[PDB]
Structure formats: structure tokens, C-alpha cells
Amino acid sequence: QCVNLTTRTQLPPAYTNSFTRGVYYPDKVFRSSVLHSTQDLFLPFFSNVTWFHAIHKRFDNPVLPFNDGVYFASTEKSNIIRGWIFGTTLDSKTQSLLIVNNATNVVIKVCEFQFCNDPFLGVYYHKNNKSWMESEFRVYSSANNCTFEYVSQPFLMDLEGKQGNFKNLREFVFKNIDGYFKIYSKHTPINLVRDLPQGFSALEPLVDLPIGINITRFQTLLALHRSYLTPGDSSSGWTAGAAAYYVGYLQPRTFLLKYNENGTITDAVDCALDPLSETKCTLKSFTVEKGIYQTSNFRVQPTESIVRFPNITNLCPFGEVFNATRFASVYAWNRKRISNCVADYSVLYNSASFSTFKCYGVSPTKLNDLCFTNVYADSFVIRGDEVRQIAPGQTGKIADYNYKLPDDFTGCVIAWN
């Protein structure tokens, strides 16, 4: 569970460039032989994506921020990639979304999973039938409070090692929209030596996950290898095959989706990438003719918000009222009308010079930003036991017989020793 790998070594987060990856269908709506403009979380073209690989002395399983969404791309031969772990803390403290392909079917579960140092899945002791069927479940130790579960169709996953170039390409898109998770999938063969192929691809929805949880980080699972001949310490002596996976970031950009006759996307344009792409977006066409065109309007954003209000001097003597030499009796409470001046409540409410303070209907902070019509101050002295009677809808010797506050009283009560 928590046993760290012997040969694992940390590496700096190297970056690599993508050609046109990050294009997917925003929804299930079908369109063909048209150029549609839409804005949604997209991976900008020619952007930088993390460069990670898995080998026998560098094993990559870092924790990456999820933000609003991320993009996945990896080149595989034996399909080393196993799955992913999604969640805020990736621990039982909250719910975490997980996707695992354990050689039988894609399993999606949302529960409170126990965090592990290096979660993953693997197989052992194949001998004379490759199998490669899930043997150990290190993804999490225990689960509870399961609010969602899904199962896909059964299939056999081929984890057997192969030589030559990378014959497989898998690219997934992960995003969150008001708690609604959308997963897109694409699978095409390739012949690649390193990095990523130069081309275009379109990703399609895989599953619908209306879960509704906050996810800020995620992990990438990898599949290791084991054998009767070269085992290791449990479980630090296990090794994995050669594979490379890349992780991107999605941003709210607008793309021009060019739809063919069959509806498949054959080209895409990123407005924020190239001013030529900006011209294409403005013209809503994938071809730009020679000439000069107006695309948008530049503007200089303000550096900061500057507020210069007039002097708040000529304040009415609230301090004198609170510290006056004498106060009127509770039955003879004086009704003081205050107007034609400014009120500075910062020195009153925030000075912590009074034992107790409370407001009815409006919080003290909001009152500082509000302009009133009429303000009245009622000053009186009562015993300690009678202080609790000063409130809307109260009764007693003071509330009923001396001074009564209406149930709709929107003022505040101030008292001190």
C-alpha cells in the first residue's frame, strides 16, 4: 500500500509542444459541412504539456492540479497506463472519483478512498498464458459512502510487451462544468519514435458522470511488471514497462470546429493562438483571403481601482453621546435625532471597546456601506439582568413597561460595563 518503489526517482517537469490536440465535441449536437464557433474549456494549440515517462530508474506518478480541467495524451505499446485518481485531497476526507481499467472492464466509483503513497495496479507470474489480469488492488485500502458506481462492457486488455515503435495512441479529456464531469476518448494507431505525432484528431464522449464534487488534483496510474524470475521487496522491487504520457491544461478558449460531410472534425482554429486565427474567428471561415481586416478592438485595462471620496469630517459627536456625563432614565429614555453630518462607524464597531454588540436585520459590516434616511439614538441605563430584555419581541419590566423594540427593528444594540 504505502511501500515506496526502490528505483523511483524524481525528475523535473519537462514540457513539450502539441500541434492541434485539445479538440472535442462540446455536446451531442450533430453538425456537418459547416464551420461552428463555440467557447468552452479547451487546451490551447501549440501549448506546453508536461513530459513524463515510465521506465525501470524514473517512475512518474506525480500529483497535478486539476483546475477547471486537463487534457491527456500518451503513446503506448503494451498499454502501461492503467487509470487515474481524481479528488480534492485524494483521501477519505472527501469523495474522490476514480477510473481504473483492470483488464476486464472500466470501473468508475465515487467513494471515500484511503490515500496511498504510490497507488497502482499490476499483475504477476504470467507463465504460459499471458493473461495479464488484475492481481493486486493497491489503488486504495478501503472505501465508504459510495454515491455513484458505473460498469462498462467487458473486454480483454493486452498488456503483453511489444518491440518496435509505439503502435498505439490514447488521448482523453477531463473537465468539470458546474459539478458535471465529462470524459472524452479517442484511440488511433500511430508509428512514433518519440514525443507526439504531428496531426489532428477528434475525441468523442465515453461516459456521463453527473457526480458533483470538487476536484483540485489528480494522479496518473501506471501498470508494472512481475515475474517468477526477478521479483523484489513488497512492493518496492516491482518494475513497469516503457511508456510516455502527457498532461495538459484546459482554458476557456473559442475554437472554429470545421465539420465534414459525415460530421467528423477535420480541422480546428484557436482564436488566441495566431492573429491569422483571430481573423478566421472574426470572419467565421477557415480560409483568409489576402487583404486587411478588423478582428477586434484593443484596450488597456486599469492597473488598479482607485477611490477618492470626499472628506468625512464634521462627524456628529457619537463619542460624546456614548461618554456623556449623565444618561436619562430607562422610562425617560431620550430620543436623539441625528442628521446633517457624517458617521464614521469604523472607530465604533471595530474598536472592541464595548462588552457586547449585536445588530438585528442587517450585519454591522453592511451598515458601513449603506446610506440611511433617519437615525435615532436611545440612551438608557438598566441592570445586568435586564440587558437580555433589549431585543425585538421581548417582555419584562423593561421591554414591556419602559422601552419596547418592534419585531421589525432594524437597528443595533450597544452595551458595555
Partner: antibody
Framework: EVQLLQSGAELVRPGALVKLSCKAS????????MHWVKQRPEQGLEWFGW????????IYDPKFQGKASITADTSSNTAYLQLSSLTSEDTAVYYC????????????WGQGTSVTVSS | DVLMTQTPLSLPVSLGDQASISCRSS???????????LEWYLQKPGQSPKLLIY???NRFSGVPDRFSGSGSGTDFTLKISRVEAEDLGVYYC?????????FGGGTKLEIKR
């Protein structure tokens, strides 16, 4: 020196259950597999199943599939075995093994436990 | 499920003689890498079985050097250089790896007289 300790013997009536413990000493229970075996005077040895304390997955002999469950205690460094719906045919001597380190090159056995199922 | 058979049931050997115990399996246990998957267990009187050889070609640590195995395919043989008085017991064959493990019929050894 690695040693596996088990109860000397157990006696239970038909239809009851017997719980056996295999203590781990001198080795890490988490990182090493555990095994169980059934021995009879006429049939010699009969394999029962294996368990990984770190993982917990268990496989049972088709003869005894659905007849028993295997559990382990990490904190106590002891492997537990449970048999249910016992009958006369279950009379045998049970053994436990482990300390494999994911490798067949190292394994050990305890003195075993004699379990008799009769009224 | 794999069926394992052993022969002979028992064999005598005087002190210093060579003892041969053979095991048969219903399925091939050798794989692409070329190694063999099998273990030999010996249960002395009043004692539980103890490992003797692993992989048929490598001796277990602490075992006397006289114990060694050889063979190929599904037919193997256990060879003891010089049998001593402490070798009394029953020899067993074991199938490992990831599969319902199989046991042998057993082979008893005795000293000639």
C-alpha cells in the same frame, strides 16, 4: 530465524466453525505472502489457499471453494484462518507458510495444528 | 486445476547411495524465459514439511549441498548425492506461480539393512 506458530490442536462438532492463527515472527507480515495446507494420512497433503496480507486477495482449492475464508491481521503479525460448515471429512492437520518476498526461493512451515471434527 | 503424480511410492537407499524421486504434471510448467517453477518439500518424522529445492536448479539456503534437482518438461527427478540418516521423511512436489497450487502423492525414503 523465521518461525511460524499455531495452536496445538482444535476440537469442534460438525456444523460448527474453527478459527486458526498463524503467528509471524522475524519477518514482515505485510510484505510476504501467506499460504495454507491440509494434510491427511491417506491423501497426504491437500492444498487449501493463499492470501496476501497487504492485498487481501485469496484463491481457494476448487475442492474447498466457498467452504472457508482467509483473513490476516497486520498489527498483530498473525494470519487467521476460518472454516465453516465443518463435517467429518474436514478432520486433518493444517499448516501455514509465508516469507516469500514475492519469490519462491524462501518459504517456511510451522509445526501445524491437528483439527478433529466429530461429535 | 493441475493433477500431479509421483513414482515410486517409496524406495530404500543405504547410507551413501543415491536416491531418485520423480514427479509428473498434467500441464507444462516451463515458460518462455526458460526457468522451471517447482519446489521440493521434505517432512521428517515429528516435523512439518521443509523446502529443499526451488526452481529445480537452485538450492534453498541452509539446505545440505547433497540435495539437487534436474529435469525438463513435465518429468523431473530429485537427486541426492549421499543420503544420510537425517533424510528420513516424505518427499513432495509443489507447483507455484499464480495458479491453484498442486501437491504430489508423496515419496517415502528408508535406509537399507
Amino acid at each position: 530465524e523465521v518461525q511460524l506458530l499455531q495452536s496445538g490442536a482444535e476440537l469442534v462438532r460438525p456444523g460448527a466453525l474453527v478459527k486458526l492463527s498463524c503467528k509471524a515472527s522475524g519477518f514482515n507480515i505485510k510484505d510476504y505472502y501467506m499460504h495454507w495446507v491440509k494434510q491427511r494420512p491417506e491423501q497426504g497433503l491437500e492444498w487449501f489457499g493463499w492470501i496476501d496480507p497487504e492485498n487481501g486477495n485469496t484463491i481457494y482449492d476448487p475442492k474447498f471453494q466457498g467452504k472457508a475464508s482467509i483473513t490476516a491481521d497486520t498489527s498483530s503479525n498473525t494470519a487467521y484462518l476460518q472454516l465453516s460448515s465443518l463435517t467429518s471429512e474436514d478432520t486433518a492437520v493444517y499448516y501455514c507458510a509465508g516469507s516469500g518476498n514475492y519469490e519462491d526461493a524462501m518459504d517456511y512451515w510451522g509445526q501445524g495444528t491437528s483439527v478433529t471434527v466429530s461429535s | 486445476d493441475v493433477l500431479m503424480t509421483q513414482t515410486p511410492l517409496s524406495l530404500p537407499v543405504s547410507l551413501g547411495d543415491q536416491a531418485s524421486i520423480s514427479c509428473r504434471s498434467s500441464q507444462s510448467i516451463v515458460h518462455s524465459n526458460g526457468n522451471t517453477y517447482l519446489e521440493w518439500y521434505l517432512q521428517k518424522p515429528g516435523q512439518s514439511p521443509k523446502l529443499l529445492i526451488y526452481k529445480v536448479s537452485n538450492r534453498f539456503s541452509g539446505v545440505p549441498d547433497r540435495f539437487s534437482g534436474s529435469g525438463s518438461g513435465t518429468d523431473f527427478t530429485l537427486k541426492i548425492s549421499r543420503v544420510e540418516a537425517e533424510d528420513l521423511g516424505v518427499y513432495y512436489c509443489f507447483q507455484g506461480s499464480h495458479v491453484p497450487r498442486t501437491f504430489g502423492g508423496g515419496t517415502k525414503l528408508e535406509i537399507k539393512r
